[PDB]
């Protein structure tokens, strides 16, 4: 059945909560983002009204044909009504279209929903700074101190300064960026801008890109690889055999790949800085997994929770088990008595 944790209590509303049929009451169903375990369970045969962002209103109609009249997209930072109640959609800092919502309840109640997040100093200058928050329904991914990661400009200058290098000293290598939904196109579009290429890939991803309201999109991507030396490919053929595979396929126009893999946190955050990065290499092919992150570290976490002062924090990730649960908890207690709210 349906989570509490996906229900706006007071409201007929539900969150992210496409994948249980009919939820009994629900009356408007808001969607965070374009991401498959938040949108599973929409199609073309969906007949009630959704709620979301314009970016993630392009995708639902184009990628998944739900249908025009079933599509409610809001405007950001608008005090807007749903049924009755006042809500309000900010950016979530995640992948293109994800917001967090801002539900203003009858009784005098507000809600913050993050959705999924990337906290941000930022964010305590939006409308969340004009008034109480009551409840938080939390993007828990990162929460455990092992999780730092870099800035995500860190990380771009980074990959921009380790393909530019590469491709100077040999203008016969191909650099390939792996992806398997949306979010992180800073990485493939910034390193593309230093080489002077549009990056290259398949029509499915070009079509998703095309809905994402990028300024100037059709200066920056294209679908014909021949003329691009940024390839993108799906994140299952980074690996040596599918490098190799793809390497055959550009016909002797390159001798040398070198490849990105931008992952989340991996244990070697713990233990090396982005300066001292070393990829695997087999041959004339090299890997790097950068840990470029859309969601908050701990650190971010727990300075946007302090600022925000909730009342009572409801998590939405790592909510399956008793170790989790119980761990985050924990966090959520010291936070409150080191701040003391
Ligand atoms: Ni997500």
Same mark, same amino acid.
């Given at each position: 059945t349906c989570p509490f944790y996906k229900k706006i209590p007071g409201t007929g509303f539900t969150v992210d909560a496409f994948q249980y049929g009919v939820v009994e009451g629900c009356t408007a169903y808001f969607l965070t983002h374009f991401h498959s375990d938040h949108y599973?369970?929409? @199609? $073309?045969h969906f007949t009630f009204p959704v709620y979301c962002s314009e970016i993630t209103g392009n995708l639902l109609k184009n $990628?998944?044909?739900?249908?025009?009249?079933y599509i409610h997209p809001l405007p950001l930072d608008t005090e807007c009504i749903v049924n009755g109640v006042k809500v309000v959609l900010l950016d979530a800092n995640h992948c293109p279209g994800a917001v967090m919502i801002l539900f203003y309840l009858p009784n005098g109640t507000v809600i913050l929903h993050t959705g999924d997040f990337r906290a941000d100093? @930022?964010?305590?200058? @939006?409308?969340?700074?004009d008034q109480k928050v009551h409840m938080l329904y939390l993007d =828990? =991914? #990162?929460? @455990?101190?092992?999780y730092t990661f870099p800035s995500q400009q860190e990380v771009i200058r980074f990959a921009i300064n380790t393909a530019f290098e590469a491709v100077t000293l040999n203008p016969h290598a191909l650099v390939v960026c792996g992806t #398997? *939904?949306?979010? $992180?196109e800073k990485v493939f579009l910034a390193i593309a801008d230093v080489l002077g290429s549009k990056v290259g890939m398949s029509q499915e991803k070009y079509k998703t890109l095309q809905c994402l309201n990028i300024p100037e999109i059709n200066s920056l991507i294209t679908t014909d690889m021949c003329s691009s030396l940024v390839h993108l490919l799906p994140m299952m053929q980074i690996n040596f055999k599918g490098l190799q595979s793809h390497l055959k396929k550009c016909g002797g126009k390159y001798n040398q790949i070198l490849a990105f893999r931008p992952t989340?946190?991996?244990? *070697?955050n713990k233990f090396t800085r982005i300066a001292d990065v070393i990829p695997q290499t087999k041959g004339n092919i090299s890997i790097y997994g950068i840990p470029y992150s859309e969601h908050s570290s701990y650190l971010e976490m727990k300075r946007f929770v302090q600022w925000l002062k909730p009342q009572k924090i409801i998590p939405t990730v790592n909510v399956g088990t008793w170790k989790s649960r119980s761990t985050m908890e924990k966090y959520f207690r010291e936070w409150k008595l080191e701040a003391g709210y």
């Open positions: 599973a369970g929409l @199609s $073309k $990628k998944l044909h739900v249908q025009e009249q100093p @930022s964010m305590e200058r @939006s409308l969340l700074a =828990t =991914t #990162y929460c @455990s101190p092992e #398997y *939904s949306i979010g $992180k989340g946190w991996t244990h *070697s």
